[PDB]
């Protein structure tokens, strides 16, 4: 009967915190703790730049920062009392709309006629053309909200499940075997909750696919 | 009445997670036939299987979040 | 003097990236609608 609370403290200090977790030394040889960060950055950058292979690869140097930021913010939430900034819908809403708008306006800046012609899937039955067009434009307008929700909802749900099962364990003053089993379930869930990085990958990869489709 | 609505709405909403269970079952099953046809388990065969499991689990937990909101 | 570090990237990708004005307009309209509810 404990009310879940994703409270709103002074956001700026919490949000800026993951940035300080990555130092950038100006040395030929790094500090064997930024080195792993650099290697991960290169490994992910290769995967992200493989698909584009265009002049839009300039966007990749910002998408790397995007994926690093989202991953750092979401991975830090697994701590006992950490407040996930991505739990709040505000910042993810403020991230999904501008980037989708950037993708569509970049598409409309160069080869604009063909960018709008991407609605045409090279012909398709003419009898159902208006239905297909309205479906695809409604999907395109859905895409930003979809991108925001597919991050916010499950990021909140992980913490919600952790809180629920933890409260169940704490309230379980009964047979200790059941308590131990529920604690094992908790640890298994938290190991699964570490897959929030896969959510970062999904978000950034969907954004990359949209940008590549429109550019 | 309102508490009864909370209970019935939660009981309904939690039934929507069954489709995500079917999806994770389907993808993890397809994992095994992909492995059988091509013994490259450590590769994208298992990487994208994990990706699909995470995506469907997201589709299920993002559903049960509504039930959690209804209950509280 | 951190502006010059990413000044080229700023106007390089914000030609369409700096459309956060749409986000600000949407947020302001939503806040006005909620204040009408409020």
């Amino acid at each position: 009967i404990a009310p879940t609370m994703m409270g709103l403290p002074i956001v700026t200090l919490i949000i800026m915190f993951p940035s300080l977790l990555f130092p950038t030394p100006k040395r030929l040889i790094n500090n064997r703790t930024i080195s792993i960060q650099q290697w991960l950055i290169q490994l992910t950058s290769k995967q992200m730049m493989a698909i584009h292979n265009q002049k839009g690869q300039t966007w990749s140097l910002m998408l790397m920062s995007l994926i690093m930021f989202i991953g750092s913010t979401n991975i830090l939430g697994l701590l006992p009392h950490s407040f996930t900034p991505t739990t709040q819908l505000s910042m993810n809403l403020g991230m999904a709309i501008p980037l989708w708008s950037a993708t569509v306006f970049t598409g409309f800046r160069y080869k604009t006629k063909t960018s709008l012609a991407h609605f045409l899937p090279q012909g398709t039955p003419a009898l159902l053309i208006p239905m297909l067009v309205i479906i695809e434009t409604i999907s395109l307008f859905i895409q930003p909200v979809a991108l925001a929700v597919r991050l916010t909802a499950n990021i909140t749900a992980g913490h919600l499940l952790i809180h629920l099962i933890g409260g169940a364990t704490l309230a379980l003053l009964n047979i200790n075997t059941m308590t131990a089993f529920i604690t094992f379930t908790i640890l298994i869930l938290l190991t699964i909750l570490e897959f929030a990085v896969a959510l970062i990958q999904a978000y950034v990869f969907t954004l990359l696919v949209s940008l590549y489709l429109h550019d | 009445i309102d508490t009864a609505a909370k209970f019935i709405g939660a009981g309904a909403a939690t039934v929507g997670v069954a489709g995500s269970g079917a999806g994770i079952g389907t993808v993890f099953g397809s994992l095994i036939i992909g492995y059988a046809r091509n013994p490259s388990l450590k590769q994208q065969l298992f990487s994208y299987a994990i990706l699909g499991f995470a995506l469907s689990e997201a589709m299920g937990l993002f559903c049960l979040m509504v039930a959690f909101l209804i209950l509280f | 003097f951190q502006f010059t570090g990413i000044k080229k990237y700023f106007n390089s990708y914000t030609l369409t990236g700096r459309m956060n004005c749409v986000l600000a307009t949407y947020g302001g309209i939503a806040l006005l609608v909620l204040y009408f509810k409020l």
Partner: peptide
């Protein structure tokens, strides 16, 4: 609990984006 308001949460993220991209621009392969 439920997200409301949406004023300053969506404002600090742009500054953090600036900071993160400036930081990672120094990173090189």
């Amino acid at each position: 609990d439920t997200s409301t308001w949406f004023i300053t949460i969506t404002s600090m993220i742009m500054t953090l984006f600036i900071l993160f991209q400036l930081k990672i621009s120094n990173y090189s392969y």
